[PDB]
Amino acid sequence: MDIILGIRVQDSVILASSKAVTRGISVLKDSDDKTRQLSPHTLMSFAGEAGDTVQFAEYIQANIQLYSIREDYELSPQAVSSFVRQELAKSIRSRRPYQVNVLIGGYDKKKNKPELYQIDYLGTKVELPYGAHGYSGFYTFSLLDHHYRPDMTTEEGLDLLKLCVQELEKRMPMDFKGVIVKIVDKDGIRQVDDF
Amino acid sequence: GYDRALSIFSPDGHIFQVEYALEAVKRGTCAVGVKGKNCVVLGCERRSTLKLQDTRITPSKVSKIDSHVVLSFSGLNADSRILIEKARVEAQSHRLTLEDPVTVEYLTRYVAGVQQRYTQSGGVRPFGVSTLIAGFDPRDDEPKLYQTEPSGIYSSWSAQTIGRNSKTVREFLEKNYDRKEPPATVEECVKLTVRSLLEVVQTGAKNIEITVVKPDSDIVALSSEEINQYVTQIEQEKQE
Amino acid sequence: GSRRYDSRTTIFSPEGRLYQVEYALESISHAGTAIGIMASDGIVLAAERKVTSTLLEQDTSTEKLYKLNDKIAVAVAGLTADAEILINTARIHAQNYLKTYNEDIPVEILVRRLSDIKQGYTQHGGLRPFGVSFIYAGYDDRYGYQLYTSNPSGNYTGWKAISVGANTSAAQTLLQMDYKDDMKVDDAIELALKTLSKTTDSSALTYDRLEFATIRKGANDGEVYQKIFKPQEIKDILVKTGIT
Amino acid sequence: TQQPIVTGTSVISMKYDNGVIIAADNLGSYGSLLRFNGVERLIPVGDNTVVGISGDISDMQHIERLLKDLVTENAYDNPLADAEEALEPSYIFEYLATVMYQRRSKMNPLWNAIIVAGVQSNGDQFLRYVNLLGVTYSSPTLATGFGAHMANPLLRKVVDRESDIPKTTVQVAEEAIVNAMRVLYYRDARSSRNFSLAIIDKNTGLTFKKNLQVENMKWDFAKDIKGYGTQKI
Amino acid sequence: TTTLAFKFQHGVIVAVDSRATAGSYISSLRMNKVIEINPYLLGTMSGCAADCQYWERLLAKECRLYYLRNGERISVSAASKLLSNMMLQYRGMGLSMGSMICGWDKKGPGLYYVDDNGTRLSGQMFSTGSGNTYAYGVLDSNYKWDLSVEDALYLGKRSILAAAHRDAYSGGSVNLYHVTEDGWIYHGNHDVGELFWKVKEEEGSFNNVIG
Amino acid sequence: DRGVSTFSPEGRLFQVEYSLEAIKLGSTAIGIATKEGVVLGVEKRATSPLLESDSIEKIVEIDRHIGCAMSGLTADARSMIEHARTAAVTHNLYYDEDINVESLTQSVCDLALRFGELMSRPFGVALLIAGHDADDGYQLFHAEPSGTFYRYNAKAIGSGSEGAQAELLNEWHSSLTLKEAELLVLKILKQVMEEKLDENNAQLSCITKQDGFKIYDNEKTAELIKELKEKEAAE
Amino acid sequence: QFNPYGDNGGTILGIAGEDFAVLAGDTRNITDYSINSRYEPKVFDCGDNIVMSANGFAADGDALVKRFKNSVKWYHFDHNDKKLSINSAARNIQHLLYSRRFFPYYVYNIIAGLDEDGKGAVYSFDPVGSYQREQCRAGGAAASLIMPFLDNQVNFKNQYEPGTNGKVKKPLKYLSVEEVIKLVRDSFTSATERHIQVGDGLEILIVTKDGVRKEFYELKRD
Amino acid sequence: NNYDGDTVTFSPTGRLFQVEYALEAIKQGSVTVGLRSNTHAVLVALKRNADELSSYQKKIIKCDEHMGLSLAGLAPDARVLSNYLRQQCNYSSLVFNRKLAVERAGHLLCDKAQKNTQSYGGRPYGVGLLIIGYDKSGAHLLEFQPSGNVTELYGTAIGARSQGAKTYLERTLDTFIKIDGNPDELIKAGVEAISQSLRDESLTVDNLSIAIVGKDTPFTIYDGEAVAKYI
Ligand SMILES: *[C@@](C)(CO)[C@](*)(O)[C@H](CC(C)C)NC(=O)[C@H](Cc1ccccc1)NC(=O)[C@H](CC(C)C)NC(=O)[C@H](CCc1ccccc1)NC(=O)CN1CCOCC1
Ligand SMILES: [Mg+2]
């Protein structure tokens, strides 16, 4: 999987991720969900080498779920993102590094703030209002730089996201088969079924 | 490494270390498990020798292993943490490798297997802990209640109690619990669990903990006032 | 072979008790009394040094109160050398947690970790347990101010007020009598010292025979300050509360 | 993985009616340099076996020590060490063959080609080959390196198949071996005139001949050869 | 090779070819590319024959042990995941395996694609091997959920035929399977040479080919 | 104290002999082998009426052609069963065939004496391993913690063993049918059991070539108990 | 750089009859353009009425055969002298080959014998352990020369019944042991003519319920 | 007494009591007889049953085509030691293409048993073995004790009441050694020897176990109706 976007608006974080999975010269699937719920108010999308992505995501998911049960408490998006970064920074000097880039969208219930973290496979973490991995940013960041405000509503965020996807669909050579969009806010995680 | 065989057979065919581990369980605070028609309730004794306690932060007696399974115990508190941790790890390991949450029977079988391993491994002593494991299997509305003990044997129970004065509350449950018609509602199930603990507890104040587990990961712990209302109603009916 | 000389430190008695844990607790009961009292606006840690000398350098001395991090401290009762082994482990665990999650370790998580280490020495390895009982005084943003205790068995519990070491029976009765929920730090300071003054085996309670510490939100705005009292400061608070 | 440094060239051998013959020159080459002229590459094991080795000389000396130790070890707690439970050619070979294959399987071979020639308890002739890869084969005639290309054709004219063995005498077989060694001296750039020859007969036992020389060589016709085509003087 | 599998109203169809190649040389005219793991579980094979046979036969051991421990058949989802986890141990060591785990369990019919990278995908239709592109063409244009067992068996059979014809490394014969809730059902070995001529005449397809 | 692998002056391993005493305290298990199949039956012995008896699993499937009953410290049997199941399936992986009942039993018994100062003590449980293969037909083995295994035509282990074994001595003959064997296990179990035998506190099972290993339903066993009562009242 | 592999040439052929089986192979051993031996046995009697030949790299072939022979020995020890069936031997060999998935036995292996119903059986293995039961199979250097001939003359491929013109196939009538040996000899004689690594001699091992019999035939030595 | 708690302890008179107690386990075991001529070597073993429903415990184990043993004592220990012999016989064949000499097989068993008598934690083997074989120096019979002592003999017997059979063989020494090229007569002498150790019970069809190895005879075991000929 190649394409993953993220945008943090006033009261939520929105993650958009492509649906395509390719094998050799054939597209095997056009409805693949490149995301895992780490906790009720934390969602992680991912992109990178085949196999490694899901493994890493599920491994992180298992660790956060274990923590949640042990402490009867949900870790902050910041705490989760730091754990994820360390695992990747640990990984890059391994015999075989996991080649996975992630976006972590979460709503901090303590601070009542949405938070978006971008982490690449090297363990390079940055908190952003909007982010992307791979070539996605090359096409979309100019639009986001122009249109983005921090006081945007969730509906305005989705409209700006549609504009980003339209630009990708126009100028990218690859057909990524559209995106699955998910929203993370105070009430938890939900999927936008029509996009 | 320290390899000494601590759990060994005696001339009369007994493993004393395993039997002395049961004596530690006998010393522990009373724990009780009762399953109704659509729920399971876990009751636990809190000894009132310890006041000035901070009840917010003090380790609670009932522990969630997953969102749909709970574990209570009687015996050594420190030993119980090791079993709970292992169980919690195995629960996530099962979800990760098989893509289904553990069944209550499987989780019990794992915890029982850990206890057994510590009865024939060198350098280690048995866990001084007996557990009550309860919950509902994924996409199933049949209640599950299991018991384990230091030897590593486990079995399913309609209702069971462990710990100090468990002999008395088991006596109560055996005459009060009908298999043909179990506690139909949550109220009836909690009432029967509180009644059973009132045979042993002393005061019905902060000495009784109740945790109700319903199907589909619906687990809640009752508060002091909610339990106190059951304590009030039971004795008012008793004055007759 | 070697079996002949093995004491077997990790076995049950016929009554279902751990011999070495019980005997370690017997050792701790002769150690200097340490008291912890939790208030709404802070925590107090008071402790009695054991029969000191006039030639002991007190201002550079530390046998009872130790700092685990900026938010958490411990009072010790038992073998000091054993406690320092555990204290350094606890300090490392707090830093590991901070490095991993970029947040200060919650008090209970640190307590559980140390208590699990103590537990391990009672179940495997064939080594003697640590002859130490801790009182943990700490703060985090989840539960606020917290008091815990751990003993050689590896069992830990939370408290509003608690004592360890010598004369805990007498001390716990006195605390249970005068403690109230709406209590404040300055009142708790007074209660801690009054309790030690009555339970002490010494003729009188003086500044040179005490270690004292507070954890206060009495730090400029929303943050927490640890105060390890100096000898002169302990002398002043003894006069203030009217003990000397 | 290595490369051979000091090397030994062809080892040649053949069966005859009552036993086997084996031969090898006394040279230890260092690339194109004919460095060591007094090297023995035929190593007897008891009075019934001779191991001829080509390839890396340091690895040869290692094998030589393994065999020396093998004899020592067989004598341990063995009253019949010089009789029924003495070392057989087939035992010695299979041991080496096991070692050679194990070493190649660890990617650290003994850079050699070995021919074990001997006579068994029951009088049967033994002649088998093994190399750095652990590859083994048996034939009425065996030769390593250049011997495989030049000596075998000559020796196979004497013993072309199994039925020719009883018809071949020791005088004929030795004559063929000695001629083959002369041909190798003419044509192999890493060969020497001096060589050793060993005969293992089921009747007369082990005969080990040292300090042999290639003789009866033809060189006279060289005087008539002038230039490379058109030159007359 | 060419393999395919798809879910439909009456379970799942599984069709494979039988050719095996060692370069341009056809080493085998009839290789079994389906493994029978249990009466309700099948596994297709594409890539290295040895890898496909070993790891899927090792899956069957592990799926069998599941039944003994739990007294219950393993799900298709869990079986596919065990296999993907095996592939993940020999990550980058050079294994070549592409398989579809087809079966019926409590959730109904199940179909999972698994390969050497560790990829594990759920889906209604899959096709693997050198001839998958040809098979997808026929499948995508003719597939429906409302297919009859007779028509569905034909579709999978016809799809392999399309690939066997065009792809040089696909052919030999067609092996058909139909998975129901009572288990899988073998629907025979069909020589492509004979099947081709038959389909040509009856269907009217392959007009460009002379016969 | 003393070594775990110590010999007594009589030439027996103390620990092995003591584990045999633990097995005598266990609930009764009986096995009978016939030419129509092997029958395995056990006493459940619930410690309380609130204990759901159907959760008491003292008869266990190792493979489709091999079953197993246990007596003694039943918790110790779990790792033995796990090993047996692994051995049975692993052999099927390596050799594409069913494993011989004797070979399976031998594999289980190889664990027995792997104790010292490996596990810290012998197993405190005996096993009746019953099965069928093509070479030796229907078989019944008794696997002890000594590492020894005997084949039996019929065998009883547990607390009522010597009383049951004497009864099996008289009753067994080479022409027993499966139905006759079923009733015979029920009869002897009912004789040695403390509580009154019924479908809830006793369990039957069998292994046949056709249908393989099967644990009997409580409804099926109940009918065999009723059939037993009537035939005993018949004379 | 050290190359742990080599090519010793050779060609093998296994054919399954109705109640018999043959495993044939030439006796020539080679490296590059040299002949090592004109008679080096390549097909072995492994016991329990099974014959094997591991063609390709001789050192790996000898090692594998040696290990399987050993596997048969221990199968008797461990399972009460039970006879190792041909299907069980095949699966055992798969696991022997895959133990070196990452440093393979560079050999093409064939075994022959009788199944548990008494019918003829041949199994074929790739170097990394993929096996399959077959009726007919040639392996090694001249495998591509021989197999098409066996498709035509054993399974009657592309052969139809005269008069019908492609409508009716030639019926698949069973072959006798004498008929099979003729096809084997003609296969190797033809292969010897056009392949330089094939020649010297041909050794055939025939397996029936009565046991294992050998037959040897000369081949051209050029 | 105070010096029998483990194998690592000498008594004041220089005795190893744990080894002596292991030796006692052999005396409790059922009788087995070994004897040989110059061409063949024979094992005869009285098998023991638990009861009438039980089978008769097997006593003879094959190690190679040319070697095998009979046991008396702890059967699992015989399985461990016979497995070791199987491997050693097999190592000799695979590496050296050489059948393992019976004398050397005895030396290997001796050294394996010895290590268990000098180290703490372990225990001595609780079984006695009679190894027969035919190698390059003809027929052989060995007696193995778990003390480590291995002895080459013409004939012997171990187990309960083994003294009766041993005396018989000591009388018959000059006769049975000469039984060359006659396997049936050598077995007869063995069956007659083991009969001197019987009381109350006699040799039945499922009671008797016989094994033989020789010049042109692979190690083969006879049980059931195959030994009815010799009853
Ligand atoms: C279609 C037909 C092609 O994609 C299918 O995918 C089939 C499916 C399998 C189940 C049959 N795929 C193959 O047949 C597969 C193609 C392939 C091979 C390798 C990697 C990826 C795909 N073919 C094989 O696995 C063949 C099958 C044999 C005939 C049973 N095997 C080989 O090619 C082997 C293994 C590779 C190898 C191992 C060790 C050393 C060298 C190569 N190769 C050979 O046997 C080559 N052999 C070398 C010696 O001289 C003779 C040829
Ligand atoms: Mg980045």
Q: Are D85 and D74 in contact (CB under 8 A)?
A: yes
Task: Pull the structure tokens for residue B74.
Answer: 């009687």
Q: Domain limits at H43? A: 1-231
Q: Is C187 exposed, middle or buried (0-12, 13-18, 19+ CB in 10 A)?
A: middle
Instruction: Report the separation in Å between the CA atom of G144 and the middle of ligand 1, taken as the mean of its atom positions.
Output: 15
Residue C18 CA: distances (Å) to CA of B126, C122, C123, C168, F84: 12, 8, 9, 21, 37
Hey, whose CA ends up nearest to atom 11 of ligand 1?
Answer: E20
Task: Pull the structure tokens for residue G209.
Answer: 């319920």
Q: Are A47 and A33 in contact (CB under 8 A)?
A: no
List the beta strands (DSSP E) in chain B. Answer: 31-35, 40-45, 63-64, 69-75, 129-135, 144-148, 154-156, 159-162, 208-214, 218-221
> What total number of domains does chain H contain?
1
- Collapse the DSSP code of B125 into the 3-class scheme (helix H, G, I; strand E, B; otherwise coil) and give the result: coil
Task: Pull the structure tokens for residue A68.
Answer: 């949640």
- Collapse the DSSP code of C68 into the 3-class scheme (helix H, G, I; strand E, B; otherwise coil) and give the result: coil
Residue C207 CA: distances (Å) to CA of C34, C50, C75, C77, G91: 15, 13, 17, 19, 84
Residue D120 CA: distances (Å) to CA of A111, C196, D116, H89, H165: 92, 98, 12, 21, 42
Return the H-helix or E-strand segment holding C117: helix C107-123
Q: Are F75 and F227 in contact (CB under 8 A)?
A: no
Distance from CA of G99 to the nearest CA of F (A): 12
Residues of G160-192 as b/e, b for ≥16 C-beta within 10 angstroms?
Answer: eeeeeeeeeeeeeeebebeebbebbbebbeebb
Q: Between β-strands C161-164 and C34-39, what pairing exists: parallel, antiparallel or unpaired? A: antiparallel
Instruction: Report the separation in Å between the CA atom of A61 and the middle of ligand 2, taken as the mean of its atom positions.
Output: 20
Which residue in this structure is represented by tokens 């052989």? Answer: H140
Cα(G78)–Cα(D177) distance, integer angstroms: 51
Residue B81 CA: distances (Å) to CA of B63, C108, G8: 9, 13, 65
Q: Among G10, G91, G8, G22, which residue's Cα sits nearest to residue G51?
A: G22
Q: Domain limits at G8? A: 1-222
Which residue in this structure is represented by tokens 């340490």? Answer: C34
Complete domains list, chain E, with CATH: 1-211 (3.60.20.10)
Find chain F residues with C-beta within 8 A of C124's C-beta: none
Distance from CA of A78 to the nearest CA of C (A): 8
> What total number of domains does chain B contain?
1
Return the H-helix or E-strand segment holding A133: none
Q: Domain limits at C83? A: 1-244
Sheet containing F149-151, strands listed edge to edge, beginning at the edge strand earlier in sequence: F59-63, F66-72, F125-133, F137-143, F149-151
Find chain C residues with C-beta within 8 A of B50's C-beta: 157
Q: Are H43 and H227 in contact (CB under 8 A)?
A: no
First vs last Cα of chain B: how many Å apart? 65
Task: Pull the structure tokens for residue D80.
Answer: 């019949």
Among the bound ligands, the one closest to the CA of G141: 1
Task: Pull the structure tokens for residue F201.
Answer: 């506190």
> What total number of domains does chain G contain?
1
Q: Domain limits at F56? A: 1-235
Cβ H18–F10 below 8 Å, yes or no?
A: no
Query: Is the Cβ of G152 closer than 8 Å to some Cβ of chain E?
Result: no
Q: Among F87, F137, F138, F140, which residue's Cα sits nearest to residue F111?
A: F87
Residues contacting B40, CB < 8 A, separation 6+? B33, B34, B134, B135, B136, B143, B144, B145, B189, B212, B213
Candidates D77, D78, D91; nearest CB to H97: D91
CATH classification of the domain holding C70: 3.60.20.10
Task: Pull the structure tokens for residue H186.
Answer: 């050598």
Task: Pull the structure tokens for residue E44.
Answer: 């297709």
Breaks (C-N over 2.5 A) in chain G follow: none
Q: Are C206 and C244 in contact (CB under 8 A)?
A: yes
Q: Are A91 and A98 in contact (CB under 8 A)?
A: yes
**By what technique were these coordinates determined?**
X-ray
Find chain F residues with C-beta within 8 A of G91's C-beta: 93-96
CATH classification of the domain holding G112: 3.60.20.10
Cα(E196)–Cα(E209) distance, integer angstroms: 10
Instruction: Report the separation in Å between the CA atom of A63 and the middle of ligand 2, taken as the mean of its atom positions.
Output: 22
Q: Radius of gyration (Cα) for chain B, nearest Å?
A: 18
Cα(C137)–Cα(E122) distance, integer angstroms: 52
Nearest CA in chain E to A29: E123
> What total number of domains does chain F contain?
1
Our mutation pick for probing the ligand 1 site, out of G57, G108, G130, counting the most ligand atoms within 8 A of Cβ, is G130
CATH classification of the domain holding H4: 3.60.20.10
User: Which CATH code fits D1-233?
Assistant: 3.60.20.10
Return the H-helix or E-strand segment holding G45: strand G44-47
Q: Are F112 and F147 in contact (CB under 8 A)?
A: yes
CA atoms within 13 A on the CB side of B146: 27
CATH classification of the domain holding F219: 3.60.20.10
Cα(E66)–Cα(E37) distance, integer angstroms: 12
Tell me which DSSP letter residue G35 carries: E
Query: Is the Cβ of F110 closer than 8 Å to some Cβ of chain G?
Result: no
What are the residue ranges spanned by the domains of chain D?
Answer: 1-233
What are the residue ranges spanned by the domains of chain A?
Answer: 1-195
List the beta strands (DSSP E) in B95-135. Answer: 129-135
Cα(F158)–Cα(F166) distance, integer angstroms: 14
- Give residue H145's Cα distance to chain centre: 10
Q: What atom of ligand 1 comes closest to residue G143's alpha carbon? A: 51
Neighbours of chain A (3+ CB pairs under 8 A): B, C, E
Task: Pull the structure tokens for residue C113.
Answer: 């970790």
Q: Which ranges of chain H would DSSP assign to H, the alpha helix?
A: 17-28, 75-96, 102-118, 162-176, 183-194
Q: Is D203 exposed, middle or buried (0-12, 13-18, 19+ CB in 10 A)?
A: exposed
Our mutation pick for probing the ligand 1 site, out of E17, E21, E32, E55, counting the most ligand atoms within 8 A of Cβ, is E21
Cα(H164)–Cα(H167) distance, integer angstroms: 5
Residues contacting G54, CB < 8 A, separation 6+? G60, G61, G62, G64, G65, G105, G107, G108, G109
Q: Ligand 1 pocket by C-beta < 6 Å: which residues? A: E 1, 19-22, 27-28, 31, 33, 45-49, 52, 96, 129-130, 169-170; G 104, 126-128, 130
Instruction: Report the separation in Å between the CA atom of B99 and the middle of ligand 1, taken as the mean of its atom positions.
Output: 34
Residues of H129-141 as b/e, b for ≥16 C-beta within 10 angstroms?
Answer: bbbbbbbbebbbb
A26, A27, A28, A53: best to mutate for the E interface, most E CBs within 10 A: A28
Tell me which DSSP letter residue H2 carries: -
Q: Between β-strands B129-135 and B144-148, what pairing exists: parallel, antiparallel or unpaired? A: antiparallel
Residues contacting F98, CB < 8 A, separation 6+? F63, F64, F65, F92, F133, F134
Strand partners, F150: F142
Chain F, residues 113-152, CB within 8 A of chain G, namely 135
CB atoms under 10 Å from CB of G218, counted, come to 12
Q: Are B16 and F18 in contact (CB under 8 A)?
A: no
Cα(F61)–Cα(G19) distance, integer angstroms: 39
- Collapse the DSSP code of C171 into the 3-class scheme (helix H, G, I; strand E, B; otherwise coil) and give the result: helix
Instruction: Report the separation in Å between the CA atom of B180 and the middle of ligand 2, taken as the mean of its atom positions.
Output: 63
Return the H-helix or E-strand segment holding B175: helix B166-176
Angle at A35 between CA A31 and CA A36, to 5 degrees: 130
| DSSP string for A78-123 | HHHHHHHHHHHHHHHTSSS---EEEEEEEEETTTTEEEEEEE-TT-
Cα(F173)–Cα(G218) distance, integer angstroms: 64
Sheet containing B63-64, strands listed edge to edge, beginning at the edge strand earlier in sequence: B63-64, B69-75, B129-135, B144-148, B154-156
CATH 3.60.20.10 describes domain A1-195: yes
Angle of helix H75-96 versus helix F101-112 axis, rounded to 10: 100
Give the active site residues of E.
1
| DSSP string for chain D | -----EEE--EEEEEETTEEEEEEE--EEETTEEEES----EEE-TTSEEEEEEEEHHHHHHHHHHHHHHHHHHHTT-TTTTTTTSPPHHHHHHHHHHHHHHHHHTT----EEEEEEEE-TTS-EEEEEEETT--EEE-SEEE-THHHHHHHHHHTTT-SSGGGSTT--HHHHHHHHHHHHHHHHHH-TT--SEEEEEEEETTTEEEEEEEEE--S---GGGGG--SSSS---
Q: Among H105, H209, H225, which residue's Cα sits nearest to residue H159?
A: H209
Residues contacting E96, CB < 8 A, separation 6+? E47, E48, E51, E116
| Reported resolution, Å | 2.9
- 3-state secondary structure labels for all residues of chain E: CCEEEEEECCEEEEEECCCEEECCEEEECCCCCEEEEECCEEEECEECHHHHHHHHHHHHHHHHHHHHHHCCCCCHHHHHHHHHHHHCCCCCCCCCEEEEEEEEECCEEEEEEEECCCCEEECCEEEECCCHHHHHHHHHHHCCCCCCHHHHHHHHHHHHHHHHHHCCCCCCEEEEEEEECCEEEEEEEEEHHHHHHHHHHHHCCCCCCCC
